[PDB]
Short mmCIF file of N, CA and C in Angstrom, two decimals:
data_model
loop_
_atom_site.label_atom_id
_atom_site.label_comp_id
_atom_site.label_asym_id
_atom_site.label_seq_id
_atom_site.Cartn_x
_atom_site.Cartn_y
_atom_site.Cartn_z
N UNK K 916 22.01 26.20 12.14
CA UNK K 916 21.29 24.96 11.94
C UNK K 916 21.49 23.98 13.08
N UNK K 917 20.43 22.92 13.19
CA UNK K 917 20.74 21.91 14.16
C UNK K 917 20.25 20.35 13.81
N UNK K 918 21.19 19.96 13.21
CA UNK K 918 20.92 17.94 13.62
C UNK K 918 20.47 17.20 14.62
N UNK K 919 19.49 16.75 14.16
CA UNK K 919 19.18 15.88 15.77
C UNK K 919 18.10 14.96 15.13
N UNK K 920 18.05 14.13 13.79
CA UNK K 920 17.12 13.02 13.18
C UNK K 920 17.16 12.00 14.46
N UNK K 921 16.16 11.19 14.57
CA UNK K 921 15.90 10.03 14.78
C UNK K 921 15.43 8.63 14.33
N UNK K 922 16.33 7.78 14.43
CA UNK K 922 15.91 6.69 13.66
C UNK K 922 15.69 7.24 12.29
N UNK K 923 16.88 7.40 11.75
CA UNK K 923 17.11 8.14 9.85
C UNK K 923 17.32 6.72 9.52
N UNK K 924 18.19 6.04 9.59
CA UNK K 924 17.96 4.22 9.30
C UNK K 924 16.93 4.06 8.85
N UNK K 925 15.73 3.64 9.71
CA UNK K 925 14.48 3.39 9.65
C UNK K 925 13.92 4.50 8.98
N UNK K 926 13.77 5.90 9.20
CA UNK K 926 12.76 6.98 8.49
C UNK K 926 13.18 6.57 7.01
N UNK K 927 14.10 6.66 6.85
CA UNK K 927 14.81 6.46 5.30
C UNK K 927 14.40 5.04 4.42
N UNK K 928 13.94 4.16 4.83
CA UNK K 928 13.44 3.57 4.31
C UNK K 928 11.96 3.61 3.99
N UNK K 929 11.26 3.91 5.26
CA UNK K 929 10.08 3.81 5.22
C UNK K 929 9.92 5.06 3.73
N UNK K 930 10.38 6.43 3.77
CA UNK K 930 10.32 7.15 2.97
C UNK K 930 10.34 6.57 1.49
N UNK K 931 11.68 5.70 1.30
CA UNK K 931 11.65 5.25 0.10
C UNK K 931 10.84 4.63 -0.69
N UNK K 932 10.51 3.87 0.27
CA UNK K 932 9.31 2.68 -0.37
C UNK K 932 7.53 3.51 0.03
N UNK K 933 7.44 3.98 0.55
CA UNK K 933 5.86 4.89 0.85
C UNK K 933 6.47 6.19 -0.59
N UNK K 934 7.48 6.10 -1.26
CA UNK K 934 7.65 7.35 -2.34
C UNK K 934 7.35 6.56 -3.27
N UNK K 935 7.85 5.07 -3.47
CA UNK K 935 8.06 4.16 -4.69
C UNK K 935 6.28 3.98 -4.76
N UNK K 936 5.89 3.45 -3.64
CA UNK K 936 4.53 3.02 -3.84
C UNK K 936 3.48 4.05 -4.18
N UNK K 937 3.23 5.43 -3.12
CA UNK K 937 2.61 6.72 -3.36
C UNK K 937 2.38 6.44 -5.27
N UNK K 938 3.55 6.55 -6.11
CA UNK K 938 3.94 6.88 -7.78
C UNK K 938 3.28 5.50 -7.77
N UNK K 939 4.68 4.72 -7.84
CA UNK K 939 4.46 3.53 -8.64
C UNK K 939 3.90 3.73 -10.21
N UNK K 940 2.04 3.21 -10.10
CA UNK K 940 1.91 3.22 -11.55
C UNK K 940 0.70 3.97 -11.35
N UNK K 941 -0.03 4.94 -12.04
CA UNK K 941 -1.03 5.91 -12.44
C UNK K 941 -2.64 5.55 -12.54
N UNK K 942 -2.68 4.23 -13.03
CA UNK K 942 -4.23 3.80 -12.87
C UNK K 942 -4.02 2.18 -13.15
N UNK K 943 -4.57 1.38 -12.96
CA UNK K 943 -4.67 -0.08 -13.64
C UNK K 943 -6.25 -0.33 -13.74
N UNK K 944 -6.18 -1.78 -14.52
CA UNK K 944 -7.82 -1.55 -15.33
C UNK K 944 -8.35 -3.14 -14.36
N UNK K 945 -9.18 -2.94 -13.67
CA UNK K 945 -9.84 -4.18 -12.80
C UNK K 945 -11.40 -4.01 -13.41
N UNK K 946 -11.34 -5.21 -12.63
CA UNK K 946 -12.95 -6.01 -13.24
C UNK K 946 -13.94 -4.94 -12.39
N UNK K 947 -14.67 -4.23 -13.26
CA UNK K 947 -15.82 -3.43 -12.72
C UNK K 947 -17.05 -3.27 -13.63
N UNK K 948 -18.74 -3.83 -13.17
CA UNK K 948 -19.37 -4.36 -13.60
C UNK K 948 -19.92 -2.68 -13.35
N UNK K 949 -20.15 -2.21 -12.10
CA UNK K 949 -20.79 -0.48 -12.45
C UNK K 949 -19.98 0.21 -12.31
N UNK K 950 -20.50 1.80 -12.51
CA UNK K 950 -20.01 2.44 -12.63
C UNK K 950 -19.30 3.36 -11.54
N UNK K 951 -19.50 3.46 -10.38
CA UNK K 951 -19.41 3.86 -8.81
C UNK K 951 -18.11 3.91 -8.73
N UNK K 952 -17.33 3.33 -9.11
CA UNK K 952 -15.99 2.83 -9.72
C UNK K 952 -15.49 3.02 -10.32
N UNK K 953 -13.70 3.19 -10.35
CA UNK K 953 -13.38 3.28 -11.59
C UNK K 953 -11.59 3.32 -11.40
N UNK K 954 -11.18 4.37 -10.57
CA UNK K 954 -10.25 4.66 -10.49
C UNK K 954 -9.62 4.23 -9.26
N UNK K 955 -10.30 3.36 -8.85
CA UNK K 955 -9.70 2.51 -7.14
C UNK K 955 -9.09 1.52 -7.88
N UNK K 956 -8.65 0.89 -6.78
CA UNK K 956 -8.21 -0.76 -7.21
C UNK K 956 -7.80 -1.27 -5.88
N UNK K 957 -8.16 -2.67 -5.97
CA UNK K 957 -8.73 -3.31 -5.14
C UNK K 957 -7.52 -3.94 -4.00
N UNK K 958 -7.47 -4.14 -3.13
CA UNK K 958 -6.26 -4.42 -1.96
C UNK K 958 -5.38 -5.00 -2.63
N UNK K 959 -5.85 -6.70 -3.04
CA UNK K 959 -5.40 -7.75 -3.52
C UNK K 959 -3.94 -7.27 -4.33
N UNK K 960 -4.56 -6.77 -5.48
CA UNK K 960 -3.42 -6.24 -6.55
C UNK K 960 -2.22 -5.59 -6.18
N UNK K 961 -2.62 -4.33 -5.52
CA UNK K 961 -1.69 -3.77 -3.74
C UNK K 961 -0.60 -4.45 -3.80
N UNK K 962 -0.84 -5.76 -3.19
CA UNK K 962 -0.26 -6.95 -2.24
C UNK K 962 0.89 -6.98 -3.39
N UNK K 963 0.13 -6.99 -4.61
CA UNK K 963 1.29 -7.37 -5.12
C UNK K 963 2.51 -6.44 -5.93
N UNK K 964 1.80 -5.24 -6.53
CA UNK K 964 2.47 -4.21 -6.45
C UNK K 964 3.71 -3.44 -5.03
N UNK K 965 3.17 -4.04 -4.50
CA UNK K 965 4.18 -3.52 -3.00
C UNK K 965 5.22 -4.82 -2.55
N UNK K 966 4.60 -5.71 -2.96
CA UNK K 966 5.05 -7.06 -2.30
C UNK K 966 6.94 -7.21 -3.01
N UNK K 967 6.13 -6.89 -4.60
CA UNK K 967 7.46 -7.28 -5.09
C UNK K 967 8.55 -5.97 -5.35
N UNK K 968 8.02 -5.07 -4.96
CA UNK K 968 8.53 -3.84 -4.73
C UNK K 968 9.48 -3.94 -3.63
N UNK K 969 9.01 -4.59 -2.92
CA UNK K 969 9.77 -4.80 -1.33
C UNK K 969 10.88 -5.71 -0.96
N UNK K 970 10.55 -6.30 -2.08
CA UNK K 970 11.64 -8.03 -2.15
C UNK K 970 12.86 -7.10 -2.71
N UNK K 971 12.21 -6.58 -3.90
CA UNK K 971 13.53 -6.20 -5.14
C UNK K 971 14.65 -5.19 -4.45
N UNK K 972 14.01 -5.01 -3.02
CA UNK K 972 14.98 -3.53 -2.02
C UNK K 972 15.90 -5.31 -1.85
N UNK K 973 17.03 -4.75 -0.73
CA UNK K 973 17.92 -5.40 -0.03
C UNK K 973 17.80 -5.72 1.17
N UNK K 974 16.99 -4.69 2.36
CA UNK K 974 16.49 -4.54 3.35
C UNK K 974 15.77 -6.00 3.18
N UNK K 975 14.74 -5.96 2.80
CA UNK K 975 13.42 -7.14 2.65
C UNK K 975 14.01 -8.23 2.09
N UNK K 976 14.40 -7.83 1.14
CA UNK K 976 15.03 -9.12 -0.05
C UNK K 976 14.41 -9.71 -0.24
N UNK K 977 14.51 -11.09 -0.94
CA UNK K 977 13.48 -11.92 -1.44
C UNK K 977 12.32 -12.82 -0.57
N UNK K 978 13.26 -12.89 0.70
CA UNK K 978 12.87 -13.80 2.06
C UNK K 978 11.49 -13.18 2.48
N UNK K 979 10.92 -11.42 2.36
CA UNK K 979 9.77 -11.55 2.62
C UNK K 979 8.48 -12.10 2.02
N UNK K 980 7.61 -12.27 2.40
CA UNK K 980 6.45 -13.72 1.91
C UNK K 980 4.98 -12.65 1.97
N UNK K 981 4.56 -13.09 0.96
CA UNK K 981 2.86 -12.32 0.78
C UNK K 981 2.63 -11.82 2.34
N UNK K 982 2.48 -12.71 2.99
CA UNK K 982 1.83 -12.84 4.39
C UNK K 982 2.50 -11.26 5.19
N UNK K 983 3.77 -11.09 4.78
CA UNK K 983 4.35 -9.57 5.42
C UNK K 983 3.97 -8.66 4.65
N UNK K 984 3.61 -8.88 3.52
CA UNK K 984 2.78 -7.06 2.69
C UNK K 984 1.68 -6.93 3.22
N UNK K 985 0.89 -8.13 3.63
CA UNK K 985 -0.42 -7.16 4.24
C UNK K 985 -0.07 -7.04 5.58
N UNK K 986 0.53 -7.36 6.35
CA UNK K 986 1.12 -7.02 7.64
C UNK K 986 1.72 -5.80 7.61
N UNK K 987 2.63 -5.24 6.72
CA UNK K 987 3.22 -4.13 6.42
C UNK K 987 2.00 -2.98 6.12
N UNK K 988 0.96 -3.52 4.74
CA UNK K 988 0.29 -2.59 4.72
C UNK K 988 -0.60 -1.69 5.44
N UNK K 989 -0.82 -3.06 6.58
CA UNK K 989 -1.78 -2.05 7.77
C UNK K 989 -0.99 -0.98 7.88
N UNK K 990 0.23 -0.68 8.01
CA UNK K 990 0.83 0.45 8.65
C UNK K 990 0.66 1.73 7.75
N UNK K 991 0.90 1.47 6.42
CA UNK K 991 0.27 2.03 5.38
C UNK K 991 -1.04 2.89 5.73
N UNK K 992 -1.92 2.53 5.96
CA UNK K 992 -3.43 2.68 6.00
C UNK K 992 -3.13 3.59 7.18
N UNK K 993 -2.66 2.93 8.30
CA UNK K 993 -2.27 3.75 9.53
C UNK K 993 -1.70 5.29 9.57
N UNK K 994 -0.75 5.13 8.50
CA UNK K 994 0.09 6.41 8.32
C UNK K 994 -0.86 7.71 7.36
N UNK K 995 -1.95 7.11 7.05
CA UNK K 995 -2.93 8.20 6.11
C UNK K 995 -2.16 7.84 5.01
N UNK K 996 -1.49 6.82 4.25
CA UNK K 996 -0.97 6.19 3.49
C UNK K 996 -2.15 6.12 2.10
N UNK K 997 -3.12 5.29 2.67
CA UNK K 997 -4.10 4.85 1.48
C UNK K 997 -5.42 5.15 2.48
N UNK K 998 -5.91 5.79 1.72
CA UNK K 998 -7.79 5.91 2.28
C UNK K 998 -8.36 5.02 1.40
N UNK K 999 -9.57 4.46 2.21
CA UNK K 999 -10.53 3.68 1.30
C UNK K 999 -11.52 4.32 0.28
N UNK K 1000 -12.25 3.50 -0.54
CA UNK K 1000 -12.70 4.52 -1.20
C UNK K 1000 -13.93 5.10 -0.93
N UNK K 1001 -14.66 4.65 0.18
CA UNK K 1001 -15.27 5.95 1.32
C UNK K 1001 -14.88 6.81 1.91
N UNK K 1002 -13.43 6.69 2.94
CA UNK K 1002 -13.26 7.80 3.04
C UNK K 1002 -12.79 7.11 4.96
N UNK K 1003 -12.72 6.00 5.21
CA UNK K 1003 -12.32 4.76 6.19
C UNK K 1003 -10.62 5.45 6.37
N UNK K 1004 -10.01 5.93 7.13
CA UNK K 1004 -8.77 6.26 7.22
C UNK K 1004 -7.86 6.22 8.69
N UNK K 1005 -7.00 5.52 9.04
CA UNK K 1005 -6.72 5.22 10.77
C UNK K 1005 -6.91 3.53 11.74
N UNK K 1006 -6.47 3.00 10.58
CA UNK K 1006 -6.72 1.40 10.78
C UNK K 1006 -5.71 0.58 10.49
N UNK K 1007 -5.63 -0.57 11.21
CA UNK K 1007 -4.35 -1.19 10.67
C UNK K 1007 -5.08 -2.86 10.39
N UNK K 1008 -6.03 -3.14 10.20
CA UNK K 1008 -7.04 -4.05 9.78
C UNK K 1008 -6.74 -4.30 7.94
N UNK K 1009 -6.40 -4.75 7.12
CA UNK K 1009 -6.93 -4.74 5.44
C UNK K 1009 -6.33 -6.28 5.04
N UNK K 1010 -7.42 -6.26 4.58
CA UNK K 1010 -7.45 -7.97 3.88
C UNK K 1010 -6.84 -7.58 1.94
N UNK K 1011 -6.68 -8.61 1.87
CA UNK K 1011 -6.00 -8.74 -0.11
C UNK K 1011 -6.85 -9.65 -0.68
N UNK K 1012 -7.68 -9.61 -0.02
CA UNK K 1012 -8.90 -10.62 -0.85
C UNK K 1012 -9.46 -9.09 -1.81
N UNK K 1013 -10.38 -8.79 -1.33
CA UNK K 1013 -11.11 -7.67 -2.12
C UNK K 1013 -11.69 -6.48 -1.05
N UNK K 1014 -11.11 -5.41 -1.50
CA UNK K 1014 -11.83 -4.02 -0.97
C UNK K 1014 -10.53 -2.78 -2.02
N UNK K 1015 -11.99 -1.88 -2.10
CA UNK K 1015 -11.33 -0.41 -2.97
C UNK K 1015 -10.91 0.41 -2.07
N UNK K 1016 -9.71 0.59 -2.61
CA UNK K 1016 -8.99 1.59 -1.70
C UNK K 1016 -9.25 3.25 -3.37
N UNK K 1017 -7.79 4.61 -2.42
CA UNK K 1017 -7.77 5.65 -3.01
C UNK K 1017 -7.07 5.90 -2.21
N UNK K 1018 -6.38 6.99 -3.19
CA UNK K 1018 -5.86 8.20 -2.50
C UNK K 1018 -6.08 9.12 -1.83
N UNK K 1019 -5.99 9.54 -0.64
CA UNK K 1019 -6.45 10.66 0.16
C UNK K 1019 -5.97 12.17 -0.72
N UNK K 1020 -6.66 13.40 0.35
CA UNK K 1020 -6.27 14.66 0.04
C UNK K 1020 -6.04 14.82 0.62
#
């Protein structure tokens, strides 16, 4: 065998929290007038599912502020993290106002 990680500090976190978030929770129910829709959910909510996910670590602690989850999340999006729900994947651009994201394959 041979050891030779880099930046395990850093990989090790990022892992934890891209594992916590990946799970997290299974579906949530948002305002949808058609049908095109259904099983996305929208940035905004994201923000906050991750936000306070991120505080409750030790790393982040409470000191990080809305304004760093969507800063964080671009990287998300970046990493093939979250696809949109077209199919938009390789960006580090996303607003928490409103847009449907998904899960990639």
């Amino acid at each position: 065998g041979s050891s030779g990680s880099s930046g395990y500090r850093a990989t090790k976190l990022w892992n934890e929290v891209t594992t916590s978030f990946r799970a997290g929770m299974p579906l949530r129910k948002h305002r949808q007038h058609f049908k095109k829709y259904g099983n996305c959910f929208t940035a905004g909510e994201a923000v906050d599912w991750l936000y306070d996910l991120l505080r409750n670590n030790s790393n982040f602690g409470p000191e990080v502020t809305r304004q760093q989850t969507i800063q964080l999340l671009r990287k998300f999006l970046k990493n093939h993290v979250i696809e949109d729900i077209k199919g938009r994947w390789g960006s580090e651009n996303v607003d928490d106002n409103n847009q449907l994201f998904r899960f990639p394959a």
